[PDB]
Design an enzyme around this catalytic site. Structure first.
Site, short mmCIF file in Angstrom:
data_model
loop_
_atom_site.label_atom_id
_atom_site.label_comp_id
_atom_site.label_asym_id
_atom_site.label_seq_id
_atom_site.Cartn_x
_atom_site.Cartn_y
_atom_site.Cartn_z
N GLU A 169 -50.46 -26.01 -36.16
CA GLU A 169 -50.79 -24.59 -36.20
C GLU A 169 -52.04 -24.31 -35.38
OE1 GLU A 169 -50.98 -23.53 -40.32
OE2 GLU A 169 -48.83 -23.80 -40.62
N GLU A 223 -43.30 -28.75 -41.46
CA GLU A 223 -44.00 -28.46 -42.70
C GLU A 223 -43.19 -27.44 -43.49
OE1 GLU A 223 -48.35 -28.11 -42.25
OE2 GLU A 223 -48.25 -27.07 -44.19
O1 LIG Z 1 -49.64 -23.97 -47.60
C1 LIG Z 1 -50.83 -24.63 -47.16
C2 LIG Z 1 -50.58 -25.34 -45.87
O2 LIG Z 1 -50.21 -24.32 -44.93
C3 LIG Z 1 -49.85 -24.79 -43.65
O3 LIG Z 1 -49.50 -23.73 -42.82
C4 LIG Z 1 -50.96 -25.70 -43.04
O4 LIG Z 1 -50.50 -26.36 -41.88
C5 LIG Z 1 -51.36 -26.81 -44.03
O5 LIG Z 1 -52.46 -27.60 -43.54
C6 LIG Z 1 -51.77 -26.17 -45.36
O6 LIG Z 1 -52.91 -25.34 -45.18
#
Ligand SMILES: OC[C@H]1O[C@@H](O)[C@H](O)[C@@H](O)[C@H]1O
Ligand SMILES: [Ca+2]
Ligand SMILES: [Ca+2]
Length: 857
Positions: free
Chosen positions: A424, A510
């Site tokens: 991100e 993710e």
């Molecule tokens: O939901 C929480 C997560 O959200 C994602 O977008 C991010 O890449 C992670 O590091 C964490 O912050």
């Protein structure tokens, strides 16, 4: 005491001095450290400091600060003329290194490995002092980082003519078609001549099973003579024809040692080993991921680096236990979010058969979340000409150094399948993003040149937002053999990606970010701050950008073109206590505020939450699952309409019969019966969904079963049936196949996961303690304070209950249970003996466990 009894690379963790202080100036050998703390590495100096609400929630309200490490040691005269280096697997962060008062250099990034040559400043035959200053100035992280030398440190001692650091690269370009017969291995070896005379050497290289003898080699080669000028290096290329190597795979992670001897005449000058495994992968835009020519769904988790109550310390047994708990869930892959792993994790995954997507960076050249001291400060800066740090390329930016250093360390690790270049990168930053595709292409070019054998990737959350930058970066990934990770796409967006970018090979880098506590049942809703600083254990609670576990998996399992999923997260981690997060200072909600995450399928103490068995029912094809929630005590259940309690069953069975047994009865009454429907994708993957008349209107919720049962004291139990309507034999089915009303707390039950551990001052034994009634049933909401008395050849190093708002010290000898459970972590000493641990609680029966420790041969 450094001499020739040491191995070429030897453990340097023992007997350091430590002092927390931003005023002391302790670089000189003659500095008086007689009052400093005495510690063995790895070591985390944040985890022992107090919580403070003027710190930041995202980093667990714990401070960092300036820490100094000193170690004084002899270099024996028998090492005169040898090359000596000190190697750091990780220091968080902003390390400065002196040797005998002389500044050697610095290293900003807290997660990449680095080294310094000590030869130039060494006192051979005399006393020596190495000094490391660590400056973890907050804010520097979106999660708890820890501070200090939190990973292993080693010394490397070699002849003047030697293989370079990480000096052997191995390629098997034709493995996929040669598999079964002779496999060509192409090797390149860096040989350095750090003497003042020309050298003429040959190499003898040997490939033999790991832990075996060289006479079981499957291939060897001796190279022609190679001239190396004084003070110069040479790259020696060679080929080994490996005779029928065993492939490395998830089920059979066969490992080999590749040994390189540098020879002058007939005498071995240097011997360098690298661990290796034979395997190949593929990512197809339509059918997804394959390992060794066979289709595999990437059933993955994202994992932050910390180890719970141990803080950031990369203890090998702690890391191994995490992988073991994940494997039991059916996990076959780990994304090292968002930074390189400890080598110990790479070692474990090589040995266990777990596929690693090793991510190198979170942010790039722009800091995130107001963390002005994070790596975005350093990514694009140059390395000073007098900074003698070693590990990667130093001719461009810190980003190139840290990326190549990581790749150099792990380039031969068969568990690593992809290099992830960022996460991100454009989220939570300021300024224009128009330069980010050019930065991405630079990182991709560096990676491809550093290691041609693996795809590069990243985790991008802007693909779902249709940013043009994501189109450019994804095409550039694809043009260089890379694979595109999309963060938090749903089914429709997966389909849109496939339609809009038919050339991309994609996966969910993710997913989910469900937020739950362990053992909370008095409401089935969540997704937001509650009144008790906890969250429901039902899979109905997720962040706004995420999705509940059943939703993120349902969308992936149906689509062969989504190669897999990396669920956020496998384990809870310190910091980011969303929905109580805070990127600035101040308590979030009434103090004590939640200080660890709620994202983990497993809590920080290693205790699984209920959704662990949903995942196990979906992912583990080597075990059966039958799990009921909620726990069946009146004061913990949620009474909805009609005083009914929602009852959820996670199972891989084809059919379940649910029963109720009133208290005081031995006769169960049938209350329900539901059958799954089996689905099969084009690639042959299968999954189960419920399609009965009372199925949920939300499709993904039908990957499990729900009944509404009126509350009454007794036992809810479930029977599993197969596709032939026959009872499934008990076997090793996992989960709570029944739930029952308990009595009051009566006793503790302590059990050490391993009853014998190594007496090296490193190995750990994990002691789970349950609060149970008189008949052994865990009291589901028990929070009794448990005290641990540790005696004998060991030390208590952590206590934990996984509870986010609990600020009690991880280093105390006591802690409240949470939802019926508490954890103690004991570590061995360096003397064999016996550890006796007694767990006590007021009004309850104590529990004692014994742990043998065994000397190192
Ligand atoms: O939901 C929480 C997560 O959200 C994602 O977008 C991010 O890449 C992670 O590091 C964490 O912050
Ligand atoms: Ca911040
Ligand atoms: Ca199964």
């Amino acid at each position: 005491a450094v001499d020739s009894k040491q191995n070429r690379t030897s453990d340097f963790d023992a007997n350091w001095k430590f002092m927390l202080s931003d005023s002391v100036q302790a670089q000189d050998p003659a500095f008086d450290d007689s009052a400093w703390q005495q510690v063995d590495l790895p070591h985390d100096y944040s985890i022992t400091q107090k919580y403070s609400q003027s710190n930041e929630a995202e980093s667990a309200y714990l401070p960092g600060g300036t820490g100094w490490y000193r170690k004084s040691f002899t270099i024996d005269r028998d090492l005169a003329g040898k090359r000596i280096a000190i190697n750091f697997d990780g220091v968080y962060m902003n390390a400065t290194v002196w040797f005998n008062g002389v500044k050697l250099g610095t290293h900003p990034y807290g997660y990449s490995p680095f080294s310094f040559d000590l030869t130039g400043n060494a006192k051979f035959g005399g006393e020596n002092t190495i000094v490391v200053k660590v400056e973890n100035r907050l804010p520097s992280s979106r999660w708890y980082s820890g501070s200090g030398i939190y990973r292993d440190v080693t010394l490397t001692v070699t002849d003047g003519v030697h293989v370079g650091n990480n000096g052997v690269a191995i390629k098997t370009p034709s493995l996929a078609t040669q598999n079964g017969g002779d496999v060509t291995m192409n090797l390149t070896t860096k040989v350095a001549n750090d003497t003042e005379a020309a050298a003429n050497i040959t190499l003898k290289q040997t490939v033999f099973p790991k832990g075996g003898k060289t006479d079981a080699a499957i291939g060897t080669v001796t190279t022609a003579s190679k001239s190396i000028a004084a003070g110069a290096s040479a790259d020696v290329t060679s080929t080994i024809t490996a005779a029928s190597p065993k492939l490395w795979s998830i089920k059979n992670p066969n490992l080999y040692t590749v040994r390189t001897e540098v020879l002058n005449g007939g005498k071995v000058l240097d011997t360098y080993d690298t661990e290796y495994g034979f395997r190949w992968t593929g990512f197809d835009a339509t059918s997804g991921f394959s390992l060794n020519g066979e289709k595999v769904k990437l059933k993955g988790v994202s994992m932050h680096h910390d180890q719970g109550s141990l803080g950031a310390v990369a203890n090998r047994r702690a890391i191994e236990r995490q992988v073991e708990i994940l494997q039991k869930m059916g996990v076959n892959s780990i994304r090292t979010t968002h930074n390189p792993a400890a080598k110990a994790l790479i070692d474990v995954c090589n040995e266990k058969g777990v596929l690693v997507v090793e991510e190198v960076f979170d942010m790039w050249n722009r800091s995130k979340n107001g963390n002005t001291e994070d790596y975005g400060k350093w990514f694009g800066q140059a390395i000073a000409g007098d900074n003698a740090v070693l590990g990667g390329d130093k001719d461009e930016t810190w980003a190139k150094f840290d990326l190549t250093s990581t790749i150099n360390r792990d380039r031969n690790a068969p568990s690593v399948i992809m290099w992830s270049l960022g996460n991100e990168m454009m989220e939570g930053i300021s300024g224009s993003v128009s330069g980010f595709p050019a930065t991405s292409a630079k990182l991709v070019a560096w990676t491809k040149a550093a290691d041609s054998t693996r795809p590069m990737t990243y985790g991008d959350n802007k693909i779902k937002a249709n940013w043009n930058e994501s189109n450019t970066m994804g095409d550039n990934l694809t043009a260089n053999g890379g694979v595109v990770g999309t963060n938090y796409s749903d089914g429709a967006n997966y389909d849109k990606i496939r339609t809009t970018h038919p050339s991309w090979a994609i996966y969910g880098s993710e997913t989910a970010s469900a937020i739950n506590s362990r053992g909370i049942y008095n409401r089935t809703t969540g997704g937001a701050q509650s009144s008790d600083k906890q969250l429901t254990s039902y899979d109905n609670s997720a962040v706004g950008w995420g999705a509940v576990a059943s939703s993120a998996w349902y969308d992936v399992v149906q689509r062969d073109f989504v190669a897999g999923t990396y669920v956020w997260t496998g384990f809870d981690y310190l910091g980011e206590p969303t929905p109580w997060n805070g990127t600035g200072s101040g308590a979030v909600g009434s103090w004590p505020s939640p200080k660890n995450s709620y994202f983990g399928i497993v809590d920080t103490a290693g205790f699984p939450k209920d959704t662990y068995y949903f995942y196990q029912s979906q992912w583990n094809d080597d075990v059966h699952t039958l799990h009921i929630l909620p726990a069946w005590n009146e004061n913990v259940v949620a009474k909805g309409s009609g005083n009914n309690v929602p009852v959820v069953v996670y199972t891989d069975a084809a059919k379940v019969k649910l029963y109720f047994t009133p208290k005081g009865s031995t006769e169960k009454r049938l209350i329900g019966e539901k059958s799954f429907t089996k689905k099969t994708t084009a690639a042959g993957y299968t999954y189960q969904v419920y399609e009965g008349s009372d199925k949920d209107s939300t499709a993904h919720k039908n990957m499990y079963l729900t009944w509404n049962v009126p509350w009454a004291e007794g036992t809810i139990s479930a029977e599993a049936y197969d596709e032939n309507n026959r009872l499934i034999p008990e076997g090793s089915t996992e989960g709570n196949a029944s739930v029952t009303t308990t009595g009051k707390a009566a006793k503790l039950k302590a059990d050490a996961d391993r009853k014998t551990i190594t007496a090296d001052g490193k190995d750990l034994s994990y002691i789970e303690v349950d609060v149970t009634d008189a008949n052994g049933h865990i009291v589901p909401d028990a929070a009794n304070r448990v005290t641990f008395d540790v005696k004998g050849a060991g030390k208590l190093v952590g206590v934990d209950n996984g509870s986010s708002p609990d600020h009690d010290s991880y280093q105390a000898d006591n802690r409240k249970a949470f939802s019926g459970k508490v954890l103690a972590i004991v570590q061995s000493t360096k003397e064999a003996g016996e550890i006796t641990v007694t767990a006590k609680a007021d009004g309850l029966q104590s529990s004692t466990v014994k742990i043998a420790t065994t000397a190192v041969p």
